[PDB]
Write an enzyme that holds these catalytic residues in place. Sequence first.
Site, short mmCIF file in Angstrom:
data_model
loop_
_atom_site.label_atom_id
_atom_site.label_comp_id
_atom_site.label_asym_id
_atom_site.label_seq_id
_atom_site.Cartn_x
_atom_site.Cartn_y
_atom_site.Cartn_z
CG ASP A 1 -18.85 64.70 -5.84
OD1 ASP A 1 -18.95 65.85 -5.37
OD2 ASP A 1 -18.52 63.71 -5.15
CB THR A 2 -18.97 70.55 -8.15
OG1 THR A 2 -19.86 70.74 -7.05
CG2 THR A 2 -19.77 70.55 -9.45
N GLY A 3 -17.67 68.58 -5.71
CA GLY A 3 -16.87 68.58 -4.50
C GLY A 3 -15.84 67.46 -4.46
#
Lengths: 99, 99
Positions: B25-27
């Site tokens: 999850d880059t966010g």
Amino acid sequence: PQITLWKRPIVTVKIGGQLKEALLDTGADDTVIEEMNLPGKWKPKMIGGIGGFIKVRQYDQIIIEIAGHKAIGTVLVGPTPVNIIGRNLLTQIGATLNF
Amino acid sequence: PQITLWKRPIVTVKIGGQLKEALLDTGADDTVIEEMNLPGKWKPKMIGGIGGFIKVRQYDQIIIEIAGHKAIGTVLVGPTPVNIIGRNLLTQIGATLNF
Ligand SMILES: COC(=O)N[C@H](C(=O)N[C@@H](Cc1ccccc1)[C@@H](O)CN(Cc1ccc(-c2ccccn2)cc1)NC(=O)[C@@H](NC(=O)OC)C(C)(C)C)C(C)(C)C
């Protein structure tokens, strides 16, 4: 380009004739943009995040340029704390996670 | 590996010796795992996202293996909708976004 993850992966996008900063988010199914008065018809939707659900307006066939890469797809507009580019558009610009 | 984004980027992780599925999850600033018994000391914390804030247990310096790659860092344990691997551990395994 390559974007490291030391900081939030935020890039400039163009939507509805405006430039905005947005978070490239592999953990997002959808693209969610902060309240903006986008033209045309929309559909009610609710989307869920870590703390619960929010109400948004679903716009289809929306033109969006992400860091220079053109895309077109569904954009959700509502009271998000951050502009989020989700997988529906990240796939269109050919983005991958690599390690 | 190189991971494309037509599907949710879910991989198998090992934490506390237990296997779980988790979303790359880059966010996400932080790593958040569903309620579980985890060896280690913890302290109360709150984190926010879409939908607002939730209460979590912060565990520091936790050993975790992500798709075969080793990390040792902060894991938040609480009522998250899905298991999330955030940038604090994504950076440890050398993950980048590319397009
Ligand atoms: C299937 O559902 C989704 O894909 N839901 C997405 C979603 O919530 N994505 C989460 C991961 C997730 C997936 C499924 C269910 C629940 C959660 C993240 O990819 C994006 N989200 C989006 C988001 C990112 C930043 C912020 C924010 C607010 C104030 C100041 C700075 N950032 C709020 C929401 N990030 C966060 O909530 C993170 N927040 C964070 O890092 O906060 C600093 C957490 C996780 C660490 C709590 C959207 C609503 C964005 C479409």
